[PDB]
Each structure stands twice: as structure tokens, then as C-alpha cells.
């Protein structure tokens, strides 16, 4: 096997030109699509805002049309999913991870229009879901679509173009090239066996979708938080403590998200009409809360800059947290199309901010700025629930651009993964694949 | 299928003892890296102090510059040729082998050989990095604690070997991410599944970085300040720069490999012809580290200067050619020390050059050569050693210019794509292949 290694080493990093070229066309499409989806969601949130202006008087009539708009659009989304593609409910990342393990089908002719138009409805209604879910899955299917449409043969081409699709999916979702590529090679890939994923092609895919994203979304960052202060060495231990707190909370949240899937499954019992209507009830509650306390609803991207700057009070933070936990669950655990990735950044910031405030007054000799703890806490729920720290840390870094906080960010994150391990919690994306993969064997 | 459900529910569960031991590994790797760093500094300093004591008599100084660097070079080649030939050159090839179980990790030998050997070659002002020394020493450190605590199992053997190499690169460039990313893009067994625990690699890198910051706070290794932005209609220029790195990446590999061979004849495997030839090269370094310091040394000094566009076109072209020469002679002669660093240096100097031509050609783009300098910095690492994701993240971590991320990726990927289609090979695999093939031949 040594002579085999000398044979292999001399032949490393040689991807077939056709796989590379097709990775490029995958990215391009994934990007344009993500960009389109992004704009669709925006347009709808905007129309909905335009209705509340047409009924800006009559207070109850406003609260009504806020509900009904988000109700109808949510219902429309749940339906498009329940009716034509049940695999494209919830996130979509569980499924694409399965698809890489050959354990799941990539029914693109179905999912693409279902996730797209479905997400358009759930997200555009102002529900507490991300864009990653939609774009990552849509991304994978797009990579599947071009695999089929061009009839590319082999394991390499099937895993790679499925992976790069997912990568360009996350990348065009957060303007985060690195986080995309890192996500694949830390989470997306078959975690227990060797695979035929070409990293170089994943890149080209991510590149293309980022370029497509920058073409249409130049000169406005997703999160602008400005350059925060530094973190002195004798401060570091406070980030460990913060991580520990995220560590014990990470799995606790996974119980809630899993259990709430079950608790909400009874309200409809797998019935299309009970579901669609239940969905429109949650959806409407979001467009309602996106008026009476917008911090509780929506994707979450709005409250991040505000929280980091320390413009929220301790009360308001605690309230934002509690109510977001609620609305994050109700939206995701009810299997509506949309990622959990984003509202998890929101919850992490809000917690980090809170811990930072307490830190600030307790240690005035440290000259703390809560916002550093807000940025350390940002990717921490990602490292404690999803258990992908290297993705979460690089995701944060790419969006907040505070590299001087690299150490506190790593330390918090690693503390969250180490304590999410020792409190018996599971990678929330595996856990749902295992529930889905087990529930398919458990009907035989 | 049912095996997968069993595995998924059991993912990311590293034995606490592997975690705990990864933490100690880092700590040691770091303190050692820090120590080595300081040693090299101390010696570069003493050698500066000698040139002061003979600051008059011109040929007398040129001589004492040679002799200091000669002697300390010879001392290094000897400590390697005599007690651990595996710790010559980089050391990264060996540790990669070590993870493939195709090479032994003789820490009782290499630790003090690489350490004090590097101290000699580096401290003499030779064109070698600190990565080589620290990465290898790092792995061996992880081996040492594996042995000394008798930790059993593949996981423990590969993990503590990897995190050692990771905490090795990490405290080498103050670059935590580049460390972890290097393991999972290059260092790992590239063709089969392995038992490396990422979570534990982290803890290791963390600890070595904390060790590095405790002794090296408040001074960055490269300070280039915040450069300008890169407009979208500029991007194609970084593709072209990448392509140019792509064609040169393999050509450089030929010369590094071929120059190992051409230098092997001057000694023929003979300890005395070797150690004296080594002192001849070493002495040429301390000499050039006086008559044109930009041609000699680790290279870290010319980067900030190059990026700001303080070098002329002539001076750049000369620093390039002369550095190609001195980089080869020092690494290809199997002296202990990484090639990682002088590869960044080469990349910056080329990038800057490309940027200057760019600036005058397209005044409507409002270019700043220094953006192309930072795009070119990790590019040689993506074309010679074919680890772009590590090279990009390494540069980003050292330069802090995240707004140049696209140019950086585009150049890098252009370098990897064109180093593939001009038949070049990952220079760290190519050396492992040479060493592993020369073992059965």
C-alpha cells in the first residue's frame, strides 16, 4: 500500500476539466438564483409594508392585514411543500447531507420550484427563517440538475457538483465565500467515510456565486458593525465562560427544536389542511410581531448591528431572546421552508451582548465593550447546536470583519462545542438526518 | 443505512483524554515555537553586534558576516547529518508521511536536532522559514506526549500528530485558522479516511497561539495597514496574475526538486562535503544580509516595504531573481527550515510587480499595486504547494485585508488551476513521493 501511495501522491489534485467547468456553471446558476430569491423575499416584505401604510389608521385593521398577508404567504409556502415536495420543508441542509451519503434523492424538478416559491412565501411573510436553507438545498439541486442535464457520470461528479451547489448556496446567502467552502469540508461531506469531493471545484463554484452576488448587491454589507475594540489577554477567560454557557444551551435548544417538531406534528397529524392552516397561523403571527415588536420576528439580521452597539437595554435583550427562541422554534420546527442558520446568529449575538453587559459593569478594569462578546457569541450557537465551529467562526469573521477578535471567537466557539459534547448534544443537522433516515426504515 | 444512523447519532465524540492531551501538546508546541523564535532572533542579533565591532575595515566585516553565518550554518547541517537526517529540509514532508504511517516520528532525535539545527540555519540569516522547524517539532512534540503517556489507538496517534503540526504552523505565523486549515487540506492522509479529531486540532492550535500571544503581543509579523478596495471590473486582473503564478508554480517545483539533486552531487551523501557546503551557503546568506538584505533572510521584512510600493521595478525584479536563487540554495540543500515563508516573500514581490504594470496600464481602475501584492502573497503557496485555502487564509490572517478576499481567492484559484494544467505537483507530496520511493528503491 506504500507503492500505492507513491502512485497516488504523484496523482493528487487532478480534477477532470469537465467537473471543474461544470462547477463554474453550477455556481453561476446557484448565485443568480440566490440573488433572485433574495430579491423576491425583499419585494414581498416590501409589498407587505406597503399594505400597512394603506391602512395606517384603523389600528385593529392594520394588525389584521399584517397577520393576513403573512398568513396567506405562509400558507402558500406550506402548501407548495406539503403538496409537491415534502423533502423541501424545514431547512434542506439535512436532505443535501443525506444526498451526499447517497441516502437521499435529489428531486430537483420538484424541489427547485417548491423551495424557491415556497421560501419566497415563508421568508417574504417575515417568518423567523434564514435564506441559507432555501439557497443551500436549491444550490445542491441546481448541481444535481446540471449533473443530469449534461449526464455527467461517476461518483466524483455526483458528490462534487452536489457539494459545490450547496457551497455556492451558503456563499451567495451570506456573501461569505470561505464559510461556504469550509461548511462543506466540516459539515456537508460524508463524515464517516472517504469521499470524492474535489475542493478546487467547490471553490470555483463558490467564487462564481459570490461574483453573481456582488454584481447585484455591491456596496451594502449584510451586517455592518464597524471596527470594534481589541481584546486584551487577561480578558480571554471570560470568552471561555461565555462558550461554556453556549455549550450547555446548545443541546438544550436541540431538544426544543426536535421535540417541537413532534409537538407540532400532532396539531396536524400529517394532514395537508391542518398543516397549511397551522402554518398560516404561525406565519401571520410573524407579520404581526414584525409590526408590534419587529425584534422578535424576521430573519434577525436587523437586530444584530443594533445589539452589538449596545443600544438595547438588559430588559429588551432578555425579551428579544425569549421571544426569538419561541418564534425560531415555531417557524423551523413546524417544517416551513427556510434555514435556521441565520436566526441562530441573531440569538447568538443577543446572548453575547447580554453576557458582555454583565461583564462590562463587573470588570471596569478590563475596559470591556459588550459588542466584542456579541461578536464572539454570534457563531457560538452555530458551534453548540450545529456543532460546526470552524464554519461558524469563519462565517462571523467574513460578515463582521473583526479579525482582532479571532481568539475570543475561537475560544467562545470551542467552549461551546466542548460543552455541547459533554452535555450529550448532537450535531442538529445529523440528528435530523438520523430522524428522517430512521423514520424511513421504521416504515417497513 | 442503519450503520449511518448509528454513526450520525455518534458523531463528534472525541475521548476526553485525546482532548486533554491535545491541549498539553499545543502548550508545549507554542512555548517551544516561542523559544525557537527568540533563539533565532537572539542569534541574528549577536551577528548584527559583531558587524558593529568591526564596522570600519570593510573586507573584515564582509568576512565576519560570512564566518558567523558559515559557522552557524555548518553547526546546523552537522546536527542534522549526524543525529537526524529526517529533520533536514522542511520537515512537513516527513510529518505528512508520519500521518500515513509511512514514516517514523523519532522525537528523541529530531526535537533537539531540528530545534538547535534550525537555530543555526535560521539564526545565520538563511532564506528559510520557521514553519518547517515548528511544524515538525510540533508533530514530534505530539508524538512525545503520545509515547510518554502511552496513549493507544489510531485516533490518538494521528490526532496528537496532527494538532502538533497545526499548533506548529499556528505559533509560526500567529495564524490559528491557517494551522487548522492546513491539517485538513494538506497534512491529512489525502486518499483515505482518517481518525483526526478536528475539535482536538483546534484546542491544540488555540493553546499554541495563546502561548505565542503571551510572549509576542502588540507587534504583528506583517503590518501592511488597510489597503484600498477592489472594484468588480478589476477582478479579471487577479485571474491573469493567478495564471502567471499557475505557470510558474510547477517550474519552481522543478528547480526545488532538481536543485536537491544537483546539490547532492557536490557532497554525494558525504557528511563533510555537506556540512562545509552548507556553511558556504549559510555564509553567503549572512554576507548578502549586509550587502542587499532583501535577497537574504526569512523575507518577512521586505513584505511591508514591497506592498507600500516603496521598491522600484528594477529593485523588485532583482529581489525576485536573487531570492529564487537564495531560496533554492537554502532549501534544496536540505538545510533545516520551512519554504513556506520565503514563498510568501516571493509571492508579494511578484504581486507588487504585477500591480505596478497594472497601475500604469489602467489609470481608470485607480489601482494600488499593494492589492496585487496581497493577492500574490499566498499565490505561490497555491501554485507550488497547491494548498490555496490554507494560503488564502494564511495571508488574510496576517495582512487583515478581508475586503480583498475575492482578488485573493481568484488569484489563488487561478494559480492552482494553471499549476494543474501545466503538470505540476503538490511540492510536499512530491518530496514525500521522492523520499518514500527512494526508500523502496
Amino acid at each position: 500500500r506504500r507503492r500505492q501511495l507513491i502512485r497516488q501522491l504523484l496523482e493528487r489534485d487532478k480534477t477532470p476539466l469537465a467537473i471543474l467547468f461544470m462547477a463554474a456553471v453550477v455556481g453561476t446558476l446557484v448565485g443568480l438564483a440566490a440573488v433572485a430569491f433574495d430579491k423576491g423575499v425583499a419585494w414581498l416584505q416590501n409589498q407587505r409594508m406597503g399594505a400597512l401604510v394603506h391602512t395606517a389608521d384603523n389600528y385593529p385593521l392594520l394588525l389584521t392585514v399584517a397577520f393576513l398577508c403573512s398568513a396567506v404567504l405562509a400558507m402558500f409556502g406550506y402548501f407548495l411543500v406539503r403538496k409537491y415536495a415534502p423533502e423541501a420543508g424545514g431547512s434542506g441542509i439535512p436532505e443535501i447531507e443525506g444526498a451526499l451519503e447517497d441516502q437521499r434523492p435529489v428531486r430537483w424538478w420538484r424541489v427547485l420550484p417548491v423551495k424557491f416559491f415556497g421560501g419566497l412565501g415563508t421568508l417574504g411573510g417575515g417568518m423567523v427563517l434564514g435564506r441559507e436553507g432555501p439557497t443551500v438545498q436549491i444550490g445542491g439541486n441546481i448541481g444535481r440538475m446540471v449533473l443530469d442535464i449534461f449526464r455527467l457520470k461517476g461518483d466524483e461528479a455526483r458528490h462534487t457538483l452536489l457539494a459545490t451547489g450547496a457551497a455556492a448556496g451558503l456563499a451567495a446567502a451570506f456573501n461569505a465565500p470561505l464559510a461556504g467552502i469550509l461548511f462543506i469540508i466540516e459539515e456537508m461531506r460524508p463524515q464517516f467515510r472517504y469521499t470524492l469531493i474535489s475542493i478546487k471545484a467547490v471553490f470555483i463554484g463558490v467564487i462564481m456565486s459570490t461574483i453573481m452576488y456582488r454584481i447585484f448587491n455591491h456596496e451594502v454589507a449584510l451586517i455592518d458593525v464597524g471596527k470594534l475594540s481589541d481584546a486584551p489577554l487577561n480578558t480571554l477567560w471570560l470568552y471561555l465562560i461565555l462558550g461554556i454557557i453556549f455549550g450547555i444551551f446548545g443541546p438544550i435548544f436541540n431538544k426544543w427544536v426536535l421535540g417541537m417538531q413532534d409537538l407540532l406534528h400532532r396539531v396536524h397529524g400529517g394532514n395537508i389542511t391542518k398543516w397549511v392552516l397551522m402554518g398560516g397561523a404561525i406565519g401571520g403571527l410573524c407579520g404581526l410581531l414584525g409590526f408590534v415588536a419587529p425584534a422578535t420576528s424576521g430573519g434577525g439580521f436587523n437586530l444584530i448591528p443594533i445589539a452589538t452597539a449596545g443600544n438595547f437595554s438588559m430588559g429588551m435583550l432578555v425579551f428579544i431572546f425569549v421571544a426569538r427562541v419561541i418564534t425560531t422554534l415555531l417557524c423551523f420546527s413546524s417544517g416551513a421552508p427556510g434555514g435556521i442558520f441565520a436566526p441562530m446568529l441573531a440569538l447568538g449575538t443577543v446572548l453575547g451582548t447580554a453576557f458582555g453587559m454583565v461583564a462590562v459593569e463587573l470588570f471596569p478594569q478590563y475596559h470591556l465593550e459588550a459588542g466584542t462578546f456579541a461578536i464572539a457569541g454570534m457563531g457560538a450557537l452555530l458551534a453548540a447546536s450545529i456543532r460546526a465551529p470552524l464554519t461558524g467562526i469563519i462565517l462571523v469573521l467574513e460578515m463582521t470583519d473583526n479579525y482582532q477578535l479571532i481568539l475570543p471567537m475561537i475560544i467562545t466557539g470551542l467552549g461551546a462545542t466542548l460543552l455541547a459534547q459533554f452535555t450529550g448534544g448532537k450535531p442538529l443537522f445529523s440528528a435530523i438526518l438520523a430522524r428522517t433516515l430512521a423514520k424511513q426504515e421504521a416504515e417497513q | 443505512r442503519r450503520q449511518l444512523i448509528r454513526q450520525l447519532l455518534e458523531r463528534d465524540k472525541t475521548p476526553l483524554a485525546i482532548l486533554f492531551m491535545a491541549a498539553v501538546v499545543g502548550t508545549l508546541v507554542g512555548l517551544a515555537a516561542v523559544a525557537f523564535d527568540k533563539g533565532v532572533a537572539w542569534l541574528q542579533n549577536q551577528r548584527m553586534g559583531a558587524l558593529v565591532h568591526t564596522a570600519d575595515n570593510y573586507p573584515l566585516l564582509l568576512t565576519v558576516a560570512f564566518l558567523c553565518s558559515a559557522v552557524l550554518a555548518m553547526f546546523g547541517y552537522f546536527l542534522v547529518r549526524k543525529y537526524a537526517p529526517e529533520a533536514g529540509g522542511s520537515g512537513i514532508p516527513e510529518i505528512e508521511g508520519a500521518l500515513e504511517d509511512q514514516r517514523p516520528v523519532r522525537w528523541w532525535r529530531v526535537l533537539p536536532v531540528k530545534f538547535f539545527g534550525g537555530l543555526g540555519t535560521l539564526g545565520g540569516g538563511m532564506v528559510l522559514g520557521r514553519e518547517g522547524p515548528t511544524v515538525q517539532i510540533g508533530g514530534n512534540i505530539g508524538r512525545m506526549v503520545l509515547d510518554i503517556f502511552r496513549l493507544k489507538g489510531d485516533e490518538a496517534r494521528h490526532t496528537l500528530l496532527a494538532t502538533g503540526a497545526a499548533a506548529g504552523l499556528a505559533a509560526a505565523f500567529n495564524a490559528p485558522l491557517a494551522g487548522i486549515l492546513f491539517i485538513i487540506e494538506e497534512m491529512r492522509p489525502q486518499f483515505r479516511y482518517t481518525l483526526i479529531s478536528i475539535k482536538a486540532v483546534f484546542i491544540g492550535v488555540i493553546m499554541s497561539t495563546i502561548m505565542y500571544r503571551i510572549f509576542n503581543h502588540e507587534v504583528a509579523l506583517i503590518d501592511v495597514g488597510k489597503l484600498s478596495d477592489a472594484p468588480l471590473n478589476t477582478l479579471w486582473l487577479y485571474l491573469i496574475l493567478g495564471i502567471i503564478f499557475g505557470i510558474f508554480g510547477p517550474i519552481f517545483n522543478k528547480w526545488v526538486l532538481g536543485m536537491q539533486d544537483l546539490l547532492h552531487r557536490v557532497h554525494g551523501g558525504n557528511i563533510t562535503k555537506w556540512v562545509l557546503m552548507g556553511g558556504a551557503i549559510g555564509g553567503l546568506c549572512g554576507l548578502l544580509g549586509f550587502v542587499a538584505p532583501a535577497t537574504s533572510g526569512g523575507g518577512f521584512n521586505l513584505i511591508p516595504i514591497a506592498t507600500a510600493g516603496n521598491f522600484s521595478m528594477g529593485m523588485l525584479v532583482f529581489i525576485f531573481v536573487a531570492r529564487v536563487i537564495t531560496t533554492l540554495l537554502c532549501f534544496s540543500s536540505g538545510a533545516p527550515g520551512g519554504i513556506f515563508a520565503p514563498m510568501l516573500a516571493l509571492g508579494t514581490v511578484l504581486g507588487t510587480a504585477f500591480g505596478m504594470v497594472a497601475v500604469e496600464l489602467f489609470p481608470q481602475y485607480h489601482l494600488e499595486a499593494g492589492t496585487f501584492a496581497i493577492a500574490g502573497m499566498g499565490a505561490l503557496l497555491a501554485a507550488s504547494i497547491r494548498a490555496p485555502l490554507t494560503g488564502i487564509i494564511l495571508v488574510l490572517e496576517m495582512t487583515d485585508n478581508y475586503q480583498l478576499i475575492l482578488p485573493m481567492i481568484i488569484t489563488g484559484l487561478g494559480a492552482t488551476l494553471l499549476a494543474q494544467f501545466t503538470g505540476g505537483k503538490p511540492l510536499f507530496s512530491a518530496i514525500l513521493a521522492r523520499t518514500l520511493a527512494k526508500q523502496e528503491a
Epitope: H218, E219 | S228, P231, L232, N233, T234, G309, V359, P363, Q364, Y365, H366, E368
Partner: antibody
Amino acid sequence: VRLLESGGGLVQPGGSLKLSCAASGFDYSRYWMSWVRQAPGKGLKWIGEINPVSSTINYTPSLKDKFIISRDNAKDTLYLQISKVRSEDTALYYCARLYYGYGYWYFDVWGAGTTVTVSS
Amino acid sequence: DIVLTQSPAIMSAAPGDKVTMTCSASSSVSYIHWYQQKSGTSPKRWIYDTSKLTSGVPVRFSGSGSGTSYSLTINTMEAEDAATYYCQQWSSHPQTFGGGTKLEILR
């Protein structure tokens, strides 16, 4: 964001004057500045431009030291020295902050302009 | 340097009219710009990269074209639109402005 250029007024033909532009509301580094002028009742003409670290400074088809564009970043201020002043330099001088969309640059926020009259 | 010459030197139209002025160039220019200079005021970056509107420009304004010919259209003109408009390129150094189309209102 305000560009408030001053220093204009009366000059005697052949002499020289230093215009200043004082900026406030944006990081005065990071931006390329420019000078555009407007002779009375006529269109717009590009005088020159200057990057942040004063390392590149292009002028328009002028002469030797006809125009000279400096900038004291420590004062958030842009300067323009016009020497050997003939009466084509009787104009309104806008200091303007420069920026790009896709990449082909434009003149972003414009100042009020100062008036320069060249007469005896 | 590129010479841009602008269609009507001066034009008159009653509000509610659809109005297009033209910017023609000596060579090939791409992603040009437009400035609005209302009377006794400094110009305002009005349209940029051939088609994008600056932030706070009514959606009644549009812009298009490529190569030699460019336009700016006010679809249903308003009387508050009375200015002189300048086109400017910097696709080729040095940047060069247009001659100015001057919109007059017929009331």
C-alpha cells in the same frame, strides 16, 4: 457629508492662488478626491484627482506646474494651487469626492464651489 | 480623450411629456453617468453606470445605451425637473463630461 471649498476670489493675471476644500462626515482617507471647474455659463472640466496617501496624482492635459493638487489628511482638507493664471481659469471650482459603481468611477458628492475671477 | 456631445443643447417640453436627451461619444464608452444641475446649484450625481439611479432620484428617471450612444429618459416629466443635465464617462482616462442638455418647462 459636506465639501466646503474656499480660498477663491480675485487674482491678478499671471499670479497664483491656493484653493482649499474642507471635508467632514466621511473618513477622509479611503477616498480619492478630485477638482472639477466650471467657467461662467459653460459646462464641466476635469482639473485633477488624488488618491488617499497622495501616492498617485493625475492631472488633465495641462502644463508643467499649471495646477498642483495636494491634500493634508490630518486636516481632512484638499488643496489646489493654480499658477501662471490666465483668464481661462476664471471659473467655479468644485472639489468632489470620487467613487465607483461596477468600477468605472464617478464624481460622488460635490462641493458648493468657490469663485475665481482673473482680472486686474 | 473621449469627446461626448449631447443631443438637444436646449429642450422644451410640457410636464406629462416623455422626454429623452442623448449623449453621443467619439469612441466606445461604457457605464456612463449623469449629473443634474438645477439653477445656481452644484451638480448631483443623478444616474450612474448607464442605468442605476442614485439614492433619492424619482423613479420617473431612466437611462440606457452602449458604445457610441447613450440616453436619459424622464418617463412623464415633471416641472420640478428643470435643470441642465451632464453625461460623463470614465471608461477611458481621462474622464470627460458632456456638453449639457438644458431642459426647459412649457407651462
